[PDB]
Amino acid sequence: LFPALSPAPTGAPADRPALRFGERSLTYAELAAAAGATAGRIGRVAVWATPAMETGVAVVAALLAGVAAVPLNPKSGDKELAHILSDSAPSLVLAPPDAELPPALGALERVDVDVRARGAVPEDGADDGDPALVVYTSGTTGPPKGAVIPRRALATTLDALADAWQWTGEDVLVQGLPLFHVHGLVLGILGPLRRGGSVRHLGRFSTEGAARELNDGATMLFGVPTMYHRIAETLPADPELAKALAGARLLVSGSAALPVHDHERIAAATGRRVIERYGMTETLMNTSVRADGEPRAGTVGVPLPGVELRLVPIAALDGESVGEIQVRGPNLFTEYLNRPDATAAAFTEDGFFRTGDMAVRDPDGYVRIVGRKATDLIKSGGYKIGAGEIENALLEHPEVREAAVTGEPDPDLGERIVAWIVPADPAAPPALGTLADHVAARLAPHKRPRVVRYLDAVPR
Numbered sequence: 001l002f003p004a005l006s007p008a009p010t011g012a013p014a015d016r017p018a019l020r021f022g023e024r025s026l027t028y029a030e031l032a033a034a035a036g037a038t039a040g041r042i043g044r045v046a047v048w049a050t051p052a053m054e055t056g057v058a059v060v061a062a063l064l065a066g067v068a069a070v071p072l073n074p075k076s077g078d079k080e081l082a083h084i085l086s087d088s089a090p091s092l093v094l095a096p097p098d099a100e101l102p103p104a105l106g107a108l109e110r111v112d113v114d115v116r117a118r119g120a121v122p123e124d125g126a127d128d129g130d131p132a133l134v135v136y137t138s139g140t141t142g143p144p145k146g147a148v149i150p151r152r153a154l155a156t157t158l159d160a161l162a163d164a165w166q167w168t169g170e171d172v173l174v175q176g177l178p179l180f181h182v183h184g185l186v187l188g189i190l191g192p193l194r195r196g197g198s199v200r201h202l203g204r205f206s207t208e209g210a211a212r213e214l215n216d217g218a219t220m221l222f223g224v225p226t227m228y229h230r231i232a233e234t235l236p237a238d239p240e241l242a243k244a245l246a247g248a249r250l251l252v253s254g255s256a257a258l259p260v261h262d263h264e265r266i267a268a269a270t271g272r273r274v275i276e277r278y279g280m281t282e283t284l285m286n287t288s289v290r291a292d293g294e295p296r297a298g299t300v301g302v303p304l305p306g307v308e309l310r311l312v313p314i315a316a317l318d319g320e321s322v323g324e325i326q327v328r329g330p331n332l333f334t335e336y337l338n339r340p341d342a343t344a345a346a347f348t349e350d351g352f353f354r355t356g357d358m359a360v361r362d363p364d365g366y367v368r369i370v371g372r373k374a375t376d377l378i379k380s381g382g383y384k385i386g387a388g389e390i391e392n393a394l395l396e397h398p399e400v401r402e403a404a405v406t407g408e409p410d411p412d413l414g415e416r417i418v419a420w421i422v423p424a425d426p427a428a429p430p431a432l433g434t435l436a437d438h439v440a441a442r443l444a445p446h447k448r449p450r451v452v453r454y455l456d457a458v459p460r
């Protein structure tokens with residue numbers, strides 16, 4: 001899976017940078033030795049997945065040990081953590097030494113990840129179908145489901161992207177994405193390591209941080225559309241950001257659609273374009289605009305190498321006929337953990353995954369996503385948010401009689417979460433802050449409502 005790390009590297013390749021988080025870093029040899037030390041302490045593991053160097057060591061340790069890692073959002077609330085811990089039943093939690101873990105984890109064995117540790121790299125005995133990660137992802141109803149992603153899916157999606165993006169071990173990625181979803185963790189940490197390149201993770205994203213790295217040796221930027229929107233807003237004021245983007249080898253957006261207004265403001269300011277790729281937790285990456293292809297705003301390009309894609313079958317490349325994307329290939333997840341019926345429902349009889357995403361293809365083969373089959377989802381900041389579980393959390397509040405949750409358009413977030421509340425007392429309805437704080441404390445801050453509306457009645 002990472003031949004630059006296992007077996008332990010030597011000579012020149014060993015002293016190449018691997019991970020950089022501000023002034024902290026690990027070379028390939030250092031990462032292999034720190035992850036090896038950690039791997040020997042863990043013969044399912046949770047990872048307290050802060051946007052910090054320890055998280056890269058932890059996840060690499062789990063992969064070197066052949067043990068599935070379950071990334072935890074360090075801002076998850078008590079309900080969300082309890083569910084993941086009960087469902088995935090990890091043996092221990094890998095954490096940074098200084099982290100303060102919440103009481104939901106009080107009974108789990110804690111293994112501190114020491115980035116200065118030096119141990120052997122374990123023999124690789126893993127098989128291609130073995131679980132690599134369990135990544136919790138929201139559905140439209142109920143608590144999040146654990147997508148079990150096999151080792152083969154990581155290797156294939158990363159090598160497919162390498163071909164599409166002309167990504168090599170000479171590339172230096174900058175990113176500031178969360179490390180408990182596949183965008184930040186699989187593409188943004190495991191990808192550079194599989195290529196033999198490096199990643200500079202910003203900790204918290206900022207336009208200034210991205211510009212600094214791109215002007216100082218970083219060659220690629222990955223972000224969600226919100227980050228590109230903030231880039232587009234800042235460009236007129238920020239000559240160094242414009243030069244940074246103009247000089248980059250590749251700018252990539254994913255997790256949600258990049259609006260054409262943001263695309264064109266970047267192109268107007270910098271003279272170059274942002275590649276979009278389309279993927280999901282359950283499928284990893286399906287399509288992309290290629291580095292050697294035509295840049296076309298509002299498209300997600302062509303199927304990656306090894307991905308079988310169909311629209312439902314719609315045969316014409318007419319830019320009009322709307323159909324459901326379905327995909328098959330070695331990029332696919334294994335199952336939803338503990339959910340064999342939901343797993344079966346997600347697949348056609350002939351083994352294609354039903355994305356729910358609606359698209360056309362143009363005469364060049366390029367896919368344009370244009371909606372959804374039956375049921376809209378909520379994407380806020382490029383996080384997929386499930387309405388049902390926010391409703392269920394709101395219903396616990398004593399000032400809420402009934403709740404419905406929707407998304408509405410937001411130029412920065414894409415969509416923002418709306419809470420529609422039948423109050424306990426219509427003359428004293430609960431304010432937004434009380435409801436937002438409650439959802440943030442139960443689930444996670446990124447899931448909080450940003451708007452509250454009061455009604456007499458909501459759907460049942």
Ligand SMILES: Nc1ncnc2c1ncn2[C@@H]1O[C@H](COP(=O)(O)O)[C@@H](O)[C@H]1O
Binds near residue numbers: 253279282300
């Ligand atoms: N570049 C993109 N354009 C439009 N939608 C996207 C893109 N990348 C991902 N998505 C959406 O994100 C979903 C996967 O996000 P997730 O559920 O977080 O794993 C897909 O089903 C799409 O709806």
Ligand SMILES: [Mg+2]
Binds near residue numbers: 140141387388
């Ligand atoms: Mg609903």
